[PDB]
Amino acid sequence: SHMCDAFVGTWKLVSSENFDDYMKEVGVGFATRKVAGMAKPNMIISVNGDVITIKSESTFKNTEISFILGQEFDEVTADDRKVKSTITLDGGVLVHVQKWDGKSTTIKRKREDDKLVVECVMKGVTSTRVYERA
Numbered sequence: 001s002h003m004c005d006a007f008v009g010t011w012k013l014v015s016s017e018n019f020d021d022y023m024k025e026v027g028v029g030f031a032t033r034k035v036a037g038m039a040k041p042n043m044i045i046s047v048n049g050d051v052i053t054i055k056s057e058s059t060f061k062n063t064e065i066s067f068i069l070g071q072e073f074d075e076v077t078a079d080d081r082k083v084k085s086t087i088t089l090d091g092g093v094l095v096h097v098q099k100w101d102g103k104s105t106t107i108k109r110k111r112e113d114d115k116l117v118v119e120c121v122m123k124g125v126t127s128t129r130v131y132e133r134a
Ligand SMILES: c1ccc(-c2c3c(nc([C@H]4CCCO4)c2-c2nnn[nH]2)CCCCC3)cc1
Pocket: 023, 026, 028, 036, 037, 039, 041, 042, 043, 056, 058, 060, 061, 077, 078, 079, 107, 118, 120, 129
């Protein structure tokens, strides 16, 4: 067992707050905002050894990242940004920082009750998205 075990599973989006504004701050264009905002992704998290895999599956796009905590990787996001990412575990929270074009955003995934609570922050705008077990 590892602390990271509480994140493993299939998680379905059940609520979203402020995601459109967050996407505006990120620089996402109108059509992508509308279609991506409409999606109801599943977040599938698994662990094999030191490698964590996070998949997002939806009608819009399917994405998959695999990584080792603290080891930077190149990621293409669902909106087609080419970013350099690092994910660490800080006090039980998975903290994902993405850097591109002199910009940064942070995505924090936390287990709270039976939910996965995901907070995304860009330049003072936060979005909160809540996922429940599928
Ligand atoms: C369908 C819809 C949205 C996404 C997505 C996107 C972004 N950020 C996330 C953040 C939210 C919290 C977990 O990642 C998700 C996401 N939402 N759920 N899974 N992935 C970046 C902003 C532009 C739009 C793409 C992926 C597929």
